[PDB]
Design a protein around this ligand. Structure first.
Ligand SMILES: [Zn+2]
Ligand SMILES: [Zn+2]
Ligand SMILES: [Zn+2]
Lengths: 392, 412
DNA sequence: GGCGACGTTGGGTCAACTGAAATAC
DNA sequence: GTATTTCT
RNA sequence: CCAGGGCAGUUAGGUGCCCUAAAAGAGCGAAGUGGCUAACGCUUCUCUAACGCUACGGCGACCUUGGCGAAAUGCCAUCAAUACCGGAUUGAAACAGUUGACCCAACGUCGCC
């Protein structure tokens, strides 16, 4: 369900990342091929068992023991934990695909090298952190493999799992031979009760969170297509109901957007709505978002839509894709893991993570500025200093 | 000998030779038949996998395996006639023999026929192309005799295909009678993403006996932005064609698909609560717009490449070894095969760097891509395009050997 | 926006096939 | 002749 | 900036007519993810809109042209469009198609910065 892919660098016999295990890629490839072959063999055994009549068949526990014995005999190099995980995963995939098998919607499920991971239980994998290096401590004595995190979110998740409950660790491969270390995790469930929303012309709404980098844009292809359809049909009628249909669509499209905004607010734990204030019935949308957010107890606050798109989110600079000249927010390239600006390059010097060019849209910047708590005070303390007048 | 296909859309299905009586639910009948064919192919592939995965000592003869697979295909779906059954088994065996080595190496997930829009395969013996008045009818045998006895409807289903093109009419009437006559092939009933059904007739036809000199060879250069440029080795004449909206159509189709897909997050209560197909129903129209625009553009480019060789008598076409470049190359090698023009594949390594006139190798020519000027001989100094230079370079026969010989002496 | 899991669809490559004799009804 | 099981 | 579709054999662009709040509404069911239930980018899913004539069976339904081409530079005539002013500009087609496999990309839900 919830898992993170971690790029691998090398394999070390010791946990200090000093002595590298030579030819570890070939050993891991042979291990994955053995895992795939054993999984295919035990899936064929499952198909043979379930294809036979139920009365003339062995018990389920006997079948699992026989599959485990066959997996151990066919590839003795596979350790017991990995073989048991292969057997369990084959049993699960057969449980999920037996109806497709016997309705012949799919052929025999098999594990290619890409989709056949070295499945390992959580009781044998330990996530340790050592300075910038991240080390997995699986027991295949116990091998320690370098893990290169490439995002700030993946670092926080990895640290939380090290100190979230780990799932069934998977080690897949790719076309180029790159091994991916995918660590599933589980979390306690706990529902929660500040954000903002910008508004353009055809971009519809955009929202950002005050404390989280979560983004979401309502790509108003629906609204644009509806407007084009109404205009074209009106032109055709003139050349040769529409107004009422357009009015009712505008009356119901705010309910869809208000529902989406309320769902996004409830998700990720947000309990306050600081939305903007007023070709389209924006007052209807404001009323709908005020009424629909009150069902969950989220207060809606209306703020002036002045100097919100022009303001920079990072530094607060005001000037007449958005890129303020003070810090170069739009044009800068930053590492995800460290958020330190670099001139160029897709690899960070401080972290070695992914460096992504900032795709800061104007709508998202306006939404994040609107999401700032106490926008009136922070805009009176800035616009008045720069001499730019605003209506209050 | 060459082979092409005649894809004819099905207007309606009938149970009479005169098409007086039609099946009121013929579309769902075709969908059921295609699903049954896909299921039979899946079970045949599963049987092949369980057979070849077992040790050879614990195996029945492969002939007995084929017989057992055919019998299980005929008994699991009694509606499938014998010809459809053996065609399905043959196609499953072909897929297995093409993927067997990688299956043994466990580098391939076991092949699975997609139930949606699955093809229905029929041997050439049963289905007969007939022409009753202006109606074009295919006497497809899609029902077994047991199903005919059980239901009361005849084994033969008359598919009223749409043959409204002059060339399509000519090929239909050429394959209708054997008397240069066309030979029928494995009929295929396959559905498009929209929901239309096609009866595809792959016909084997004799290679055209056009007198083309094999000495004259024409090279084909595939650039990055410049689509294709061709030149002749024996004649200074040449030609070229580039892509107008070559990637713009793909970009706009993908942008529209992304915009429509993102709308489900704020769509109505129906798309969000009636399955994935109900959610991708608006996307279904965009299922093959750019995929089929790939074929339309590549057909046009390959047609001009083969026509240029035919007009100038060039009996050979050179193609560099790799936008779908390989799809264009395949269309070229299949359209030229119709006209009897052999295609030779060569390595395009250092082809652009080598001068088309003197054959010398250079490294500074990589920077200048708008035009080609050879510093040593001065062929372009005394204007020659870089694409034209590469085309003329690859026009001459045995270019890989020349590149290997020249690179060893100098230029690596 | 991205880092991913699951899933699907939607673009590519790439390679082969695109029956016939015999046989029961 | 027609459809089916088989063989390549 | 005059959108998406349906028919016109396929595709792409038009085109002749029609439909559109299909970027839309609903129903059976449990093959799966979720908590025996049905929330789900839940389903072998299905229904939901579309050319003219018909004597209700069926019929018909258009264009992407021909050459010169030491070359995406264009020219000659011919067609269609222009929200440009009878001219100018723009575009001017071919059809080999199914399969499976692999790759990449995109998107839906979910977890998180
Ligand atoms: Zn700034
Ligand atoms: Zn960094
Ligand atoms: Zn030269």
């Amino acid at each position: 369900v919830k898992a993170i892919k971690l790029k691998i660098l090398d394999m070390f016999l010791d946990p200090e990342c000093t002595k590298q295990d030579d030819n570890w890629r070939k050993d891991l490839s042979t291990m994955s091929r053995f895992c795939a072959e054993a999984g295919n063999m035990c899936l064929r055994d499952l198909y043979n068992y379930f294809s036979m009549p139920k009365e003339d068949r062995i018990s389920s526990k006997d079948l699992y023991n026989a599959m485990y014995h066959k997996t151990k005999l066919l590839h003795p190099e596979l350790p017991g934990k990995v073989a048991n995980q292969i057997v369990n995963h084959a049993k699960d995939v057969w449980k999920r695909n037996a109806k497709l098998i016997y309705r012949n919607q799919i052929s025999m499920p098999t594990y290619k090298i890409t989709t056949a991971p070295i499945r390992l239980q959580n009781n044998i994998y330990k996530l340790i952190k050592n300075k910038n290096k991240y080390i997995i401590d699986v027991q295949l004595t116990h091998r320690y493999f370098l893990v290169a995190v490439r995002d700030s979110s993946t670092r926080m998740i990895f640290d939380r799992i090290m100190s979230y409950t780990q799932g069934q660790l998977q080690i897949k491969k790719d076309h180029q031979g790159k091994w991916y270390c995918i660590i599933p995790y589980t979390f306690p469930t706990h529902e929660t009760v500040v954000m903002g929303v910008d508004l353009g012309v055809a971009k519809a709404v955009y929202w950002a969170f005050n404390s989280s980098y979560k983004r979401g844009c309502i790509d108003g292809g629906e609204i644009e297509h509806f407007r084009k359809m109404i205009r074209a049909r009106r032109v055709s009628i003139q050349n040769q109901t529409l107004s009422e249909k357009e009015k009712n669509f505008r009356d119901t499209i705010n309910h869809r957007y208000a529902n989406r905004i309320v769902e996004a607010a409830i998700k990720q734990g947000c309990g306050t709505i600081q939305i903007e204030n007023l070709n389209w019935p924006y007052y209807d949308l404001q009323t709908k978002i005020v009424n629909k957010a009150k069902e969950h107890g989220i207060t809606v606050v209306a703020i002036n839509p002045q100097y919100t798109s022009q303001r920079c989110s990072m530094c607060g600079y005001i000037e007449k894709v958005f890129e303020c000249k003070q810090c170069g927010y739009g044009s800068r390239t930053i590492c995800i893991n460290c958020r330190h600006v670099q001139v160029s390059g897709d690899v960070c010097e401080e972290c070695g993570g992914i460096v992504k060019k900032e795709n800061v849209n104007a709508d998202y910047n306006a939404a994040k500025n609107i999401s700032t708590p106490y926008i009136d005070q922070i805009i009176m303390e800035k616009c008045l200093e720069l001499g730019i007048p605003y209506r209050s």
